[PDB]
């Protein structure tokens, strides 16, 4: 709910004691309590000002170790005070597994834990040390309730793996396979549970981003910009303008439920090869999806503007969108229907009345 990771308990102070934090090489959260020092280790960079000593008075101290991925904060609240362990904890990790920790020391008391993947308040046996790691296997069942970020992250790393070396794969994937995967990917992006307003999956040759739309989003247009560093791959940057009508709930729609924006940015056309295998500028294929919605006959069009290096001696640039035939099981094709092109030498803009 409110944080990615919460580990709480009580500490019996039998003497003047210290707080110690280290950045671990391993992606674990390690908590080790000795009589003189409470030690916390996490994969995040150490904040440079971490206080050395705990409050002088002896007694029982309630504590909670907090991690939040989008706030980038790993802080330890302790008794009446709060200690900031890391200020740059913005890294995709999923804590759902406790490892056996056989360290000796002063056991912690009334310990409990809850994470994003395991949101229940789970009491743990008291122990001098605790180790929190992740499962590698996908333990989330086929509930369709929510998709796990780290599971989706590995799936998108798998696709990126194929885009880098599509010649190396064991098979040339059929159209039905690719269509099934792109449906699955879209489905998982609309249902993935995360804490921030935006979640981006940035991989080699693919970048998928999820926007949690506000109720206010229907009121105003949406502007999106990207950065690609101007290498000589023929495409350098893009911008998007999404009209307010695209985000508007339908006339007979109810409940004002949250909707999501999906921008899947491909730097590869491996999944979009028509018959005759037509080429696309910079292999750029840009997927735009409003969750479970099709809009058509737009007054103000969605516009896609692309900066590129010109190669116009024997070629013209035409804005198109990928269309497939359900019940064909055959490769798709490009269509320019309802999409107007303005193609200056170094810049081209696509004006489409639908997405």
């Amino acid at each position: 709910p409110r944080e990615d990771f919460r580990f709480c308990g009580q500490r019996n102070q039998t003497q003047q004691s210290t707080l110690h934090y280290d950045q671990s090489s391993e992606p674990h959260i390690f908590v080790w309590n000795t009589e003189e020092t409470l030690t916390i280790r996490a994969p995040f960079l150490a904040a440079p000002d971490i206080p050395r000593f705990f409050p002088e008075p002896r007694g029982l101290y309630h504590f909670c170790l907090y991690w939040s991925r989008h706030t980038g904060r790993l802080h330890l609240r302790y008794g009446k005070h709060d200690y900031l362990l890391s200020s740059q904890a913005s890294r995709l990790l999923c804590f759902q597994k406790q490892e056996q920790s056989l360290k000796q020391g002063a056991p912690l008391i009334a310990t409990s834990v809850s994470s994003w993947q395991i949101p229940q308040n789970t009491s743990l046996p008291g122990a001098p040390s605790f180790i929190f790691s992740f499962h590698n296997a996908p333990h989330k069942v086929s509930h369709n309730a929510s998709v796990d970020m780290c599971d989706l992250k590995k799936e998108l790393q798998q696709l990126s793996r194929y885009l880098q070396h599509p010649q190396k794969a064991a098979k040339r994937p059929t159209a039905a396979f690719i269509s099934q995967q792109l449906q699955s990917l879209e489905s998982k992006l609309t249902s993935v549970s995360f804490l921030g307003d935006t979640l981006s999956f940035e991989e080699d040759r693919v970048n998928a981003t999820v926007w949690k739309l506000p109720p206010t989003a229907g009121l105003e247009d949406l502007h999106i910009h990207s950065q690609k560093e101007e290498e000589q791959s023929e495409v350098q940057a893009y911008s998007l303008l999404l009209p307010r009508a695209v985000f508007q709930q339908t006339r007979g729609r109810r409940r004002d439920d949250a909707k999501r924006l999906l921008v899947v940015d491909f730097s590869s056309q491996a999944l979009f090869q028509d018959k005759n295998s037509s080429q696309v500028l910079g292999e750029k294929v840009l997927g735009i999806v409003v969750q479970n919605t099709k809009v058509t006959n737009l007054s103000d069009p969605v516009v896609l503007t692309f900066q590129h290096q010109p190669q116009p001696k024997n070629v013209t640039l035409q804005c198109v969108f990928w269309v497939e035939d359900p019940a064909s099981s055959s490769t798709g094709s490009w269509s320019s229907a309802g999409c107007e092109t303005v193609s200056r030498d170094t810049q081209t803009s696509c004006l489409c009345n639908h997405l």
């Binding site: 979009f272 500028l281 999806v289 070629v315 969108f321 490009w334 320019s336 997405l355």
Partner: peptide, 9 residues
């Protein structure tokens, strides 16, 4: 919907 800019000769 996946938008792209076709290269037509």
């Amino acid at each position: 919907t996946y938008f792209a800019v076709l290269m037509v000769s």
